[PDB]
């Protein structure tokens, strides 16, 4: 089962787990109240998986590509990695399907406290437009991921503060309505 937790108070070493002490796990159901959705898939089948297709059609994820994040192969690696981990939001969904390796997506909860989501092979996640988030590799320092998008992609991050955007306003409005 996919693991998520509240983070400790250390600001050092973003790639470590940073589990709060004592443990404060976060359920998939609490993530749903933040509009964060999750599916589990057989990642070996990603080239041809009726179960992925079901998700894509339901959600209108009509666009996809594959990205591989490691020091050696990714162009402009160091800079891209810095940008991923800056707290930011987008005007669209962020949908990522992990094909190999692993990573952390951090999201703010309703009190603006960080929740760390551990994503592994087979895990697929969508972060809603307007949510403040960031991504980092974990200590294994490797991830291969499918990126999906509702239509032709725009990747632009807006680093916090980014509160004026309609996507942020609507997302705040969505949060009033959940548990
Ligand atoms: C696999 C996640 C990396 C990424 O595409 C992002 O954080 O924008
Ligand atoms: Ni992002």
Curated annotation (Swiss-Prot):
It catalyses: 1,2-dihydroxy-5-(methylsulfanyl)pent-1-en-3-one + O2 = 4-methylsulfanyl-2-oxobutanoate + formate + 2 H(+); 1,2-dihydroxy-5-(methylsulfanyl)pent-1-en-3-one + O2 = 3-(methylsulfanyl)propanoate + CO + formate + 2 H(+). Gene3D superfamilies: Jelly Rolls (2.60.120.10). Its main location: cytoplasm. Residues 1-24 are annotated as: Disordered. It is found in: Cytoplasm; Nucleus; Cell membrane. Ni(2+) binds at residues 88, 90, 94, 133. This is Acireductone dioxygenase. It comes from Mus musculus. The lineage of its organism: Eukaryota, Metazoa, Chordata, Craniata, Vertebrata. The gene is Adi1.
């Amino acid at each position: 089962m996919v693991q998520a937790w509240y983070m400790d108070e250390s600001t050092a070493d973003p790639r470590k787990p940073h589990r709060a002490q004592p443990d404060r796990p976060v359920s998939l159901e609490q993530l749903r109240t933040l509009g964060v959705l999750y599916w589990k898939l057989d990642a070996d089948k990603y080239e041809n998986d009726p179960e992925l297709e079901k998700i894509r059609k339901m959600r209108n994820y009509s666009w996809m590509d594959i990205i591989t994040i490691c020091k050696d192969t990714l162009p402009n690696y160091e800079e891209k990695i810095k940008m991923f981990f800056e707290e930011h939001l987008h005007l669209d969904e962020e949908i990522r399907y992990i094909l190999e390796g692993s990573g952390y997506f951090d999201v703010r909860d309703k009190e603006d406290k960080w929740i760390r989501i551990s994503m592994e092979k087979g895990d697929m996640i969508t972060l809603p437009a307007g949510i403040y988030h960031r991504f980092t590799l974990d200590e294994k320092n490797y991830v291969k991921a499918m990126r999906l998008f509702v239509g032709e992609p725009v990747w632009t991050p807006y680093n916090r503060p980014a509160d004026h955007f309609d996507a942020r306003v609507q997302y705040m409005s969505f949060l009033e309505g959940t548990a």
